[PDB]
From Swiss-Prot:
Protein name in the entry: Nuclease A
Cellular localisation: Secreted
Region (Disordered): 116-136
Positions of the catalytic residues: R30, E38, R82
Biased composition (Basic and acidic residues): 116-132
Binding sites annotated in the UniProt record for Ca(2+): D16, D35, T36
């Protein structure tokens, strides 16, 4: 079973990436299961809705009283050394919030790191239905 652990915000980097202090050490975290338009995209640079997704994530983590990270069942860091987790701000999952607002698409998922896949696909279906941002 998955469980939440405390962390402290250092700095928000992009819509899909945030730097946190986890267990007394600075780390860069990549949000699990979501794909957001980017401001620092290697080839494309600043994509459409990139500034929007980036501002949303920043506001959510900066205004929170408690930040918690929830690792999935598989590997905990990717090839770039970024932690892979579901991030919660005062009990609300940031990953789901972005998808629900049409500021992110559910990424090409791959087990075992796919516990909340169905939950996120449902939120994406609702965002499409409502024609929000990305889907407008």
């Amino acid at each position: 079973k998955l469980h939440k652990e405390p962390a402290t915000l250092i700095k928000a980097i992009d819509g899909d990436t945030v730097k946190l202090m986890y267990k007394g050490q600075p780390m860069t975290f990549r949000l699990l299961l979501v794909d957001t338009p980017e401001t620092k995209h290697p080839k494309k640079g600043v994509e459409k809705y990139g500034p929007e997704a980036s501002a949303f994530t920043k506001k959510m983590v900066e205004n929170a009283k408690k930040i918690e990270v929830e690792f999935d069942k598989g590997q905990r860091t990717d090839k770039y050394g970024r932690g892979l987790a579901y991030i919660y701000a005062d009990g609300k999952m940031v990953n789901e919030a972005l998808v629900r607002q049409g500021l992110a698409k559910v990424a090409y998922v791959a087990a075992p790191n796919n516990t909340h896949e169905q939950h996120l696909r449902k939120s994406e279906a609702q965002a499409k239905k409502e024609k929000l941002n990305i889907w407008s």
